[PDB]
Amino acid sequence: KPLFEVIASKIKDSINRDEYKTGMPNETALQEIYSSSRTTIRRAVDLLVEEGLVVRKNGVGLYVQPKLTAQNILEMTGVMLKKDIKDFYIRKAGKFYAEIFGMKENELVYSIKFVQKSEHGATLDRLILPLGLYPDLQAKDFQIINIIELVNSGKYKLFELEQELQLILAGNEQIKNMHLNENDPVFKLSSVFYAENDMPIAIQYHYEDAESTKYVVDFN
Amino acid sequence: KKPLFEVIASKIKDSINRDEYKTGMPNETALQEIYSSSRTTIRRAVDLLVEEGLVVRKNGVGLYVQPKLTAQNILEMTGVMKNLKKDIKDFYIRKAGKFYAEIFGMKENELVYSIKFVQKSEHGATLDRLILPLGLYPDLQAKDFQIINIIELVNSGKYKLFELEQELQLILAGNEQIKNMHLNENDPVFKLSSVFYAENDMPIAIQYHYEDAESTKYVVDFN
């Protein structure tokens, strides 16, 4: 078995025992820790990335991916009616979020997706929080009971909220998570949270079934 | 001549005009003393002021001066002199009534500020209505009701903002939307309702925001 695979397994263990914390040693440090080559480390880390265990901060270092253990789920939501977490992971901002946040598209953001049983059907929420703006949070700190509190828990204080409201056709996200049919009408409430001086610090998308006995929505 | 209650109402009006009394005054008993007049005379003077929309009673409690949208206050509240800015249509004190009393968990006869403003946007004018209970924003004068940043304003009273609860609806345009947003009757409108809470499940403010829901991508057929 190749060395890089051996080292990747060794690092997986370190991650399993919370030795490396989301919120780890860079690749140069890993060379020294494992007395191995740059190439060996790069290939070991490539494998861990592919498995979704860690993520690189281009030209900076390495982050461990958050894990939705029963314990972290308990910390974040209070459970085990309520809020069910579907996804929590770190990803590059990409171009779309880079323009909104005014950051580099290869810089990292947290992406959180959760569903909630409500009045008329399940609702779906997506939260995007730039890693550089919420530096000190560990997975258990990402409590989703109160979104205002969460958005306020990072490096900057929440100052202002800017919101957009739309009617859209149910997409794959909605049909799957909200139990809707192709093209059913859905309210999309988009929120951009700002710190002072026009600095966006978080984005949120909230979706609800728009069906009603009062009207019919007809999309072209 | 001019009856005494009217003479006294004029003097109170004068005091109001010179900001001796203002939003954020002596109660009716103190007025009896100040003007050396009867309970009945003072009650009639105040009735006159209330009718003129210059003051409002707090059930027994006392007397509040109604805020004034003078040029100065408007400048203070919105930063605007004399679009894409905020234009105040209404600012006054009123009883909560059943509907708001139930939301705030307060007494129907207790007072709230009602603020209405309009804003030019991409898909036309939007309309906002804010409700802030007096007892939760006791120390604010007229010029303190800055509406540049609603979160800042909601956070500026007795309690700190802790949580936000929102409701999303499609409604038919009513008179408010007709006049203020230049829509036709039964035009579809987005209504975004916000309830702002302090810690421990205590509502401190309500906001209703309205936007034209017309789109080139769908039509809304109301029943």
From TrEMBL, chain A:
Molecular function terms from GO: DNA binding; DNA-binding transcription factor activity
Biological process annotations from GO: negative regulation of DNA-templated transcription
Matching SMART domains: HTH_GNTR
Keyword Transcription: yes
Domain HTH gntR-type stretches: 1-67
Key word Plastid present: no
Alphabetized SUPFAM superfamilies for the sequence: Chorismate lyase-like, Winged helix' DNA-binding domain
Keywords attached to this entry: DNA-binding, Transcription, Transcription regulation
Coiled coil: none
InterPro entries tied to this protein: Bact_HTH_transcr_reg, Chorismate_lyase_/UTRA_dom_sf, Tscrpt_reg_HTH_GntR, UTRA, WH-like_DNA-bd_sf, WH_DNA-bd_sf
Protein name: Lin2111 protein
